Amino acid sequence: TMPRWVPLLLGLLGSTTCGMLLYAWSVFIKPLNAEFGWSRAEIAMAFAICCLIFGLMTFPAGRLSDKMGPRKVVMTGGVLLAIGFILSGFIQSKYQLYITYGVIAGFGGGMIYLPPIATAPKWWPDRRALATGFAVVGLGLGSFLMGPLATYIIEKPGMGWRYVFWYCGVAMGIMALIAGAFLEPPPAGWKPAGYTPKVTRDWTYEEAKGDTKFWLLYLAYFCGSFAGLMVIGHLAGFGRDAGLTAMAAAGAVSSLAFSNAATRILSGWFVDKIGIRVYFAALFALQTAAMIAIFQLGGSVVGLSIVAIVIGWNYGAMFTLFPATCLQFYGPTAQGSNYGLLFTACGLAGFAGPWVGGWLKDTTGTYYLPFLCAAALCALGTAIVFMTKPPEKKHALELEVLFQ
Ligand SMILES: O=C(O)c1ccc2ccccc2c1
Q1: What CATH number is given for 201-389 in this structure?
Q2: Residues on the Cytoplasmic side?
Q3: Ligand 1: does its nearest atom lie under 6 Å from the Cβ of 54?
């Protein structure tokens, strides 16, 4: 039937739509402050709500993708995202923005984000992590696509920022509907392959949800996610405090977007070839080291760039390697449910990480506390990821007894 790279393209399209949605808020920071008395933190509340709902809704999205297929889920998510984003276009108050952008749009976003992550590796049992990475790389590209577009619309005279919400929401709805229209697993039996009585079987959602290793991974995910989201917004400020100009610190920190994108594909290909656990643990350890190392390297464009690139590499890699690990532990059959539940950890980290980092800096007045806390979290994640080996593969005695 359909060439097994089409799923990768579809996940690229859907994840790009989600990256556009999650990047937009920064674009509207200044215009919304121009029209209303709206503070930066007041607008950032809409983003934090968006991350909360988006991360939470992967769980129901994964369950529904497993039960009734990923097409229905992704297309419904497209509808919800389009509705919420466009209604943000017609807003007049903060609560309206929280509802439209944070809740509705974030809801549709989780429903878009998860089903392709669960479907793509099924077409690539020889390259599961690379397939997953194609399902997530779009989150690193939404900036590069939307930034110029949203600036274009905001500054144009017949338009405004409301016009960004309206048009960009039609465009994102179309991309998500095109992604979800052609998305489905391969048929129940034959598996696309040129190459390939005890009888094992993948784990079930109730079985994985009850494994101690699933929650060790959940803890690692929460730690790594929280650490990144706690400091990334502080990189450029660390630079300016070290004596750099705003232009210079901004240039340096911008290399984070490139490594954040590239790692999603490259880390998948790497672990497809050499295995997950050791490289994964090494990434967390390096993330620990970078949280410490910024106090020695962050005072120059070259050092701050290195730290930013490294932080971006490790952070972005989490979103390919946690789904790949979950796929190795439990198999693809319940990957929708297993990984939907697991990603709720990111919903919570998205809600609280940035706020807590800001509070720690403002409480102390210095960057030592947030980066030291992020280093500790990344150290814990390092230990967890390094010590956690796959559970025993499951026996399917009900299939096994079919042999006379
Ligand atoms: O980088 C990602 O893949 C991603 C997507 C959705 C997310 C939602 C909440 C927090 C972090 C998130 C990260």
Answers
A1: 1.20.1250.20
A2: 69, 124-127, 182-211, 275-276, 331-334, 388-396
A3: yes
